[PDB]
Design an enzyme around this catalytic site. Structure first.
Site, mmCIF file in Angstrom:
data_model
loop_
_atom_site.group_PDB
_atom_site.id
_atom_site.type_symbol
_atom_site.label_atom_id
_atom_site.label_comp_id
_atom_site.label_asym_id
_atom_site.label_seq_id
_atom_site.Cartn_x
_atom_site.Cartn_y
_atom_site.Cartn_z
ATOM 1 N N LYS A 115 63.425 -38.120 41.851
ATOM 2 C CA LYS A 115 62.437 -37.054 41.955
ATOM 3 C C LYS A 115 61.378 -37.434 42.991
ATOM 4 O O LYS A 115 60.867 -38.556 42.979
ATOM 5 C CB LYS A 115 61.788 -36.809 40.588
ATOM 6 N N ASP A 204 54.967 -25.258 27.320
ATOM 7 C CA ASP A 204 55.832 -24.331 28.051
ATOM 8 C C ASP A 204 57.313 -24.619 27.764
ATOM 9 O O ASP A 204 58.121 -24.832 28.682
ATOM 10 C CB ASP A 204 55.513 -24.380 29.557
#
Lengths: 325, 120
Positions: A115, A204
């Site tokens: 990442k 979320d």
């Protein structure tokens, strides 16, 4: 790609030293903090501008160089190469909005996922905000993997880079059918209660943050948004995530729930919301440190005179004036 | 085999006109457009190999660069490589495929088997 493997380390790290304190770093300062080779680093900078490694700035009085998006990225991979985690590049790349996913391969040939944070205020602050993001994400990734959670395995962190376990699948948003909807549903419902047990709420927890591995195993990624259960609206973020999954399986797969979990368990697990007397040998060491600092300060002043660009601009106009007279 | 209610017996002995009224929509265009000076020369070279064949042999493969040509029923059994761009292929002309074109059996591309997604 990475061909050059000597002077490029020292010069680019010297930019990162100036980036933490100031905006655009002058070329005078670079050579002083990269004292290993003198004078010939200015041609290295001219090779760095060929790539997307550094950017030039000559505004009004501000003369020097700043580090780029891609230039900051190469520095992490150069450090990960020395830690023997990254060697060659895998091509399957999921270009996102907050980060980029690059497939990497080690000495073994074992493929891992990398990442790279791409937060996009001047570029100096943007390449500092990505620094805090990786350190925070790696912190949760270590915290959950140790506590039995089905997350990618943390390997190494370098400035903005995070090496994780290669879990290859499809995100839940682009899934047509699941062979066993009920078992997958109960797996996901357990994971909200699991986090609440450790004193965490996802916030979320949607279909946009869940990946299925061969339609058997639910994988969770992306952790900078997480909140404590000490929060006043703790049960609201808990219930919103429940209703999001309740309606989704009813919408996409037409599965209605028989089990309605609304248990508040804080905390039965680890609270992860927090997440002649002097010997001659010493005399030698101390005298050495004094003598190195005297030489290092003098070398800085020798390198600060490199201004070479100022002398080049002054020479061009004088030739024009003398010819016209 | 039978195409449009007409057996393989009648298809060979008919007129050139009368084969049209059996054809498809795109195919009745072209024979009224006319087969050209190169495509008159490709139906003539196929009459030679079939006739100079041993009668237990379907004829030798004869190369060409006319992919777009329809299969006329007198072309049935004529081994013709149809070119893709690179190198020829083998296409057994069956009577089942008269309505189609020769181009679709010379497969242009090698179909895609994905290798892993690179640095994206």
């Amino acid at each position: 790609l990475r061909y050059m493997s000597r002077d490029d380390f020292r010069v680019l790290t010297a930019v990162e030293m100036g980036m933490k304190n100031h905006e655009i770093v002058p070329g005078s300062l670079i050579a002083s903090i990269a004292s290993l080779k003198h004078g010939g680093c200015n041609k290295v900078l001219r090779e760095l501008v060929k790539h997307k490694l550094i950017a030039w700035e000559r505004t009004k009085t501000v003369q020097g160089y700043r580090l780029t998006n891609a230039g900051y990225d190469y520095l992490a991979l150069k450090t990960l190469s020395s830690r023997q985690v990254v060697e060659s590049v895998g091509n399957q790349m999921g270009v996102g909005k907050e980060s980029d996913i690059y497939i990497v391969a080690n000495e073994e040939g074992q493929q891992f996922a990398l990442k790279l944070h791409r937060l996009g205020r001047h570029n100096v602050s943007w390449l500092y905000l990505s620094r805090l993001s990786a350190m925070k994400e790696f912190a949760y990734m270590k915290a959950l993997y140790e506590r039995k959670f089905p997350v990618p395995k943390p390997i190494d962190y370098n400035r903005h880079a995070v090496v994780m376990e290669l879990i290859n699948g499809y995100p839940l948003c682009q899934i047509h059918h699941v062979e066993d909807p009920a078992s997958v549903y109960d797996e996901a419902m357990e994971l909200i209660v699991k986090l609440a047990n450790h004193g965490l709420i996802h916030g979320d927890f949607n279909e946009f943050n869940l990946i299925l591995d061969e339609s058997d195993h639910i994988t969770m990624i992306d952790f900078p948004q997480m909140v404590s259960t000490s929060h006043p609206n703790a049960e609201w973020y808990f219930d919103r995530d429940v209703k999001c999954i309740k309606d989704f399986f009813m919408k996409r797969f037409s599965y209605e729930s028989e089990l309605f979990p609304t248990f508040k368990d804080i905390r039965r697990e680890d609270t992860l919301d927090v997440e002649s007397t002097i010997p001659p040998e010493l005399v030698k060491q101390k005298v050495k440190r004094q003598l190195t600092k005297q030489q290092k300060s003098a070398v800085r002043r020798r390198l600060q005179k490199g201004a070479n660009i100022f002398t080049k601009q002054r020479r061009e106009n004088m030739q024009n004036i003398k010819s016209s007279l | 085999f039978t195409y449009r209610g007409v057996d393989l017996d009648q298809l060979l002995d008919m007129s050139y006109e009368q084969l049209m009224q059996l054809y498809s929509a795109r195919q009745r265009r072209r024979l009224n457009r006319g087969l050209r000076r190169k495509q008159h020369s490709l139906l003539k070279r196929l009459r030679k190999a079939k006739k100079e064949a041993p009668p237990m042999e379907k004829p030798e493969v004869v190369k060409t660069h006319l992919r777009d040509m329809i299969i006329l029923p007198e072309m049935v059994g004529s081994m013709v490589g149809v070119y893709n761009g690179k190198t020829f292929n083998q296409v057994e002309i069956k009577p089942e495929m008269i309505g189609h074109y020769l181009g679709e059996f010379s497969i242009t591309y090698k179909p895609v088997k994905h290798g892993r997604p690179g640095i994206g």
